[PDB]
């Protein structure tokens, strides 16, 4: 009864060693490994400090102008400040754009928008998953609707030309006239090229649909002006706040304000629809600590240092891509305009499925992903590689070239094992051969050692060992 009070102060290290120990082991893993997973990054210490603030304590359902409870004087200073920085960072005119900073994460942001502009069973079109789209843009089979989007709404994806790896805009333009989408999505989870926002705008207006951009993967790039901004032609832009924007996990919803089209003019009604859908529609009390962390991230995002960070991110990607091309690897669409590349491993007689696991054992983090061609989804040809994370650690062109070599050493290993299994062997067996065969296991150890030594050369953003 007395200690209860001593209990609320007691640092985490003392109060709970088991959790603390985990956090440590994780921090250390993150250090010695090479993070190449496109969606990963490292939040600054400032952002992380915010999440721990007393901002966790206040409930503030509603919005600045009107909340359900009182005493929100400061939360209001915060949310408001956060919006000013969100529009500012993207050079948006507060008279043409508004922004909701309450989404809990990326997926939630998208759903809020669908719930506000589409409505139950409304039609939605997005990049087909195996072509590089995201679940939240639609995901169903001929027998079941898996994604929440594909359950409460009616989704149909558009594909990319399997010979150029590019989005087939012509086919999409045609299909839209038959499908009558209420909303078309412009966003990708694994696509190395800029999107033709201008085209998509013509296609959306043609069918009277809304054009929503999902810049979760390029949000940071867009800010530094390293890739074309989606705010030029889109009606709405949703985004995560982590990944390339390097903040804590949360999401935002940008929406236009003002005159939409003449004749005599009609206005944009997105604001209230979207705000009402987030709340009291879908969410409850906002996570203010996460909002503070985003605000911090946006301040940092407008600095020239960030600006430079991004230029570096993209250049690293290019050098990495070039290095792998030179090693004889095939890059979908032959190259990239951003932070990632899809390496088609068919050109080496293996697949990303087996390859991602071997590279992992060597502490080289990345993931598989089908290439435009691929006939089977149960044996994806590609590996996706992103440079945001490692760049935030300081890696430069020279550094990545060495990385490319490490990945190549891995692909070779992966191949060595695969021929050691059989044409009709399963991923289960493959994985099992890699676990109980000192022969390969030794090789792994050797490369893991090299991988982890190199990684140790760079610092690890975050708190002092946390």
């Amino acid at each position: 009864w007395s200690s209860h009070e001593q209990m609320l102060a007691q640092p985490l290290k003392d109060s709970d060693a088991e959790v603390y120990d985990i956090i440590k082991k994780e921090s250390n893993r993150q250090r010695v490994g090479l993070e190449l997973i496109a969606s990963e990054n490292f939040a600054s210490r400032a952002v992380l400090e915010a999440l721990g603030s007393c901002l966790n304590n206040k409930y503030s359902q509603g919005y600045p102008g009107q909340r359900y409870y009182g005493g929100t004087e400061h939360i209001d200073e915060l949310e408001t400040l956060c919006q000013k920085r969100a529009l500012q960072a993207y050079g948006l005119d507060p008279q043409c754009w508004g922004v909701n900073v309450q989404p809990y994460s990326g997926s939630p942001a998208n759903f809020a928008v669908y719930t506000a502009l589409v409505e139950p069973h409304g039609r939605i079109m997005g990049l087909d998953l195996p072509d590089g789209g995201h679940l939240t843009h639609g995901f169903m089979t001929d027998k079941k609707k898996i994604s929440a989007t594909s359950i409460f709404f009616e989704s149909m994806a558009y594909k990319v030309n399997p010979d150029t790896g590019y989005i087939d805009y012509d086919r999409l333009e045609e299909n839209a006239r038959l499908f009558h989408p209420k909303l078309i999505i412009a966003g990708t989870s694994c696509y190395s090229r800029n999107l033709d926002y201008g085209r998509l705008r013509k296609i959306a207006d043609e069918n009277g649909a809304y054009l929503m951009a999902d810049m979760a993967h390029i949000s940071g790039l867009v800010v530094a002006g390293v890739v074309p901004s989606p705010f030029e032609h889109c009606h709405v832009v949703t985004t995560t706040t982590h990944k390339t924007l390097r903040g804590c996990r949360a999401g935002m919803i940008f929406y236009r304000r003002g005159v939409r089209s003449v004749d005599k003019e009609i206005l944009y009604n997105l604001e209230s629809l979207i705000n009402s859908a987030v709340f009291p529609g879908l969410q409850g009390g906002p996570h203010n600590h996460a909002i503070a962390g985003v605000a911090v991230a946006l301040k940092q995002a407008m600095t020239p240092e960030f600006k430079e960070y991004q230029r570096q991110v993209v250049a690293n990607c290019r050098a990495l891509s070039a290095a792998l091309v030179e090693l004889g690897y095939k890059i979908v669409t032959g190259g990239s305009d951003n932070h990632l590349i899809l390496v088609d491993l068919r050109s080496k007689g293996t697949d990303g499925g087996r390859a991602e696991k071997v590279l992992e054992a060597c502490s080289i983090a990345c993931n598989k992903n089908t290439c435009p061609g691929d006939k089977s989804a149960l044996r994806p040809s590609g590996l996706r590689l992103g440079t945001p994370a490692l760049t935030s650690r300081g890696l430069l062109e020279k550094d990545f070239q060495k990385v490319a070599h490490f990945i190549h050493r891995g692909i070779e290993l992966t191949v060595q094992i695969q021929d050691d299994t059989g044409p009709r062997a399963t991923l289960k067996e493959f994985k099992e051969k890699l676990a109980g065969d000192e022969k390969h296991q030794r090789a792994v150890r050797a490369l893991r050692q090299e991988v982890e030594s190199f990684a140790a050369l760079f610092p690890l953003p975050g708190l002092p060992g946390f």
Copy 2:
């Protein structure tokens, strides 16, 4: 870059003074004020430290043993540990219960469940809002569906007897036969009494429906064993992790496993698939670590005691207000909150919540079972979790009751000066513009804030 590094490792105080200054002012407001909002509380320092960990960086969409990406060795230790502590804290047998610890918050947890067990347009019944229910349990009018629940699903609420303030179980039992709910919700946002989970189970099984409990408000109480556990009769239990459980903002979904009656339970996969890849993306592992910390703390006798205190404080507060002549809906409480019907003082919570606020006494309005108009709620909701976490005891709350009373009197005064009839905006105008009043507010605010300063404020050292 030369500087790019230092930036990422720099402290918040230096890196961003504007945000830091805000956090400070907030920390200080929380200190000198008296938090009586039922849903509020204060997370311990341990929980808060976890949210800042490097756990923010790792993406781990999927589940332990079923992750999309590799390198989840530790996240797995975590999520798993978190589930072991979640079932443990509630004395649940891992063979009869499972638990999803990925929800981002309370509302999301509920939706995940609806999406898994109900399905588009499936019928759902829950406590009607003005009677003390939550939006996520359904909220629509005769012309529009507002809540996500009421949009993607078909909701119809059940009310409470307006003369006892209790849930009319008889009427619900009858209406279920006509509405055919696929799922009935057992949970409240402003209800001072235990729920007849046993009854609701009979009603659910009668219509072959699922009985989902939403213990967001009493999650902490349930753990200390201070209120009956909803796990005895329910098929599913959703909950927030903050509020009375005192963790960071997140949510959990408890579901049964094993035999239902031979027939089994298929809740597990349905619910897991609905959270992901159904509704969410990468889980917020830092929030999960904070919950884990909260659950360890929740199983301590100190927490156990904290809860006993919470409920006792509420009683004393309730008694003190009764003695001051206030009417308590259903006459009392079995938990951490009470709905004070201000009709018995000639005013309403709408005007009263704002005046009390100006005096730094935090709380909120809420219609009472009677109330004919929703635009002039008779009640004020008062909870004791927050102030109890600061150390307040029976004696302390009695003083609090007095402060609230002083407030109600003030709010009434601004009323008599405005006239028995006047719009809410008229009322607030006097509150602000009037020497005797704005002055009165200052006086009570001063006393309120002095008293509050006497107690500590949980959290990280000094913000």
Copy 3:
């Protein structure tokens, strides 16, 4: 071809003897039997002649003044004439009412309206089936949606007081506030009392819902002014054109025009668009001509008298059965039918309808308000429209009542021989296999059929 012509102009009797023979046998069955099925009647020869016209050939999708194809000069004269007679027959002012005469039948008419005013998943409330409602008004269980209405829309029925047999309007008024119906239905398939249209209008307007009346069973009565007209308070009135209106099988949708309260009514276009191009294709003009003929006949004093007779027959029949000790649900009737609760004789309509049938007395079972099991309905429904169209009068029906009674006794006998407990199939077995019984049936069948022969059989000369 040499023969191809003659084929198309040949008579049915020669062209197809098998079908012709069937029609004959049916015509003859209809003659010697006693039709007491509430929904049955006999169309006049004029109506029947219309169905055979060349009106079958023309396709006229659309509406007068809005046809897809040309050459509709006459179809237009027809449809238009039909509408003039439909509004006329019900004394409706063409400035306050419009009418669609294209529905293919009763059920289609209702669906057209739901599709126009409700919309996918819109809520609808109607009389619960076991209490006397129609499928099209909603029909689902706790596990499946059976009726089209209950599939594409969200239906919840209201019941009747099981002790008065009357519709519990108080409970309905209450539940509407919780269910938020977009449309409430006023219509019955087996209810002997007038509906409180005035009440239902208050309830509909309270929830901003539409009040749709389904007068399929009393359409003819309403015209003769023998029962209160539903056009006084309703927004829409759907109806079949057969049954008590005595026309061919088809349906109509009456809807209001003008001012609703300034606000207007937008029902017209919604409903017309929903019938076409919404739900149907080319209208069956021959059926429309038959309806027109029926409406002209319906406005005659002879029809007017026919109806008065129909209702009087029912009363006498009801009285005669009461005197024989039978229990009538709600104790009596205000129209053409009565629900005889056979519990008061130790049997059920299920067994009874089949025995009476074997004796050539046509009628059907139907649960009574009380009834605990739907697999053993207590009641028998009896209507007088059909037999009245044959000329039966009070005296005649009293004899009929006796015949039905003789039947109930027989059905009971087969019961006592089977034992207080026995499955329905067991019962029917005795009915058939047993000298004393199959013999008894023959005896009563003979008397039933002799009496029936005494009256004429409306329709075309001799089939």
Copy 4:
């Protein structure tokens, strides 16, 4: 009160002169005019006599094996007989096919099937209207769902190659993988070619969807074996009973029974689903008189005389098509395989919209319909012409050639008027110029006279002046 009894007998001619008079004027119009509307025909006297029977009187909800009421002894003989003739007429094995004969009409039959196999919001694909599809196969715009099908279900149409006038099966095959239809429709309202049922079956099975054929327009042809039967590859076949089958207005739903696919085999569950959907799902008491009329039509349909009638129908169409080709008219897909042709009037500088109305004034019945090309739906290029009706009157190749000339005389007239109005004139004005201009009105009279004289030469099926 006394007369009431005399009222139920009193013939229609006496009981109601106003209706009778109408029926007469209609019968006479049908006689002197030339019916070329593809969906029209003339029911035999036998069929018409059935509709008037006492079969109107019995209520028989349910089905032969189980009805809600009794005394259905004969209705059962009927419905049953009707089904035996429906399967018989199409040479279907009662062990592989079943049939529902209760639909009230064509549209209702389709909906019953959708309600049974698709379910609310289930996806359905069908021929796009402007390409020759039917409303019931789906009809919506980018802003509204018009058809019942497009309201309660999710429909997306497939088009035809605008340069061949044929259905683009390749594009459909592709789109099905993105749309995931639960049911694909094989049926047309204005398409002169056979459908590749075999192809559509591959496409349906590929996506695990049902293949429903809607043979409303070729039902009669299919029976005579003049066009390929859709029962060879389809799971379900819906049809109207009038049109080319020449019965009264009603509809039927044919469905398969037995083993569907092996591995070990799975069965067809269509029967109960469809029956339950018709009733108690969608309809009430069946219209037995209409069913008797259908039965009569099916008996007549199996005769060699009918068989011959159909061969004639198709040959007439060809000669008509040839005659118009020779007159310089353009026929979509250049010809026909059945009873109709879509004449693209662009090749004469006019459109079907103006042309259908002028031909009408000349007592030549037909209708407009957009051609594959057509940029605007408010100025369809084509006219649809069918031969079923006129053939049932006895017209032969020589006769149709004369008909073609009459239609041509009309198109010329139509053109004369149009140049007399202006490039930017409306159909309202066009129609009005044709009504109040003795100049043209005189021409019309002249051709109407010739048209009506010729028509008088042939008999008019049906009753003796009814």
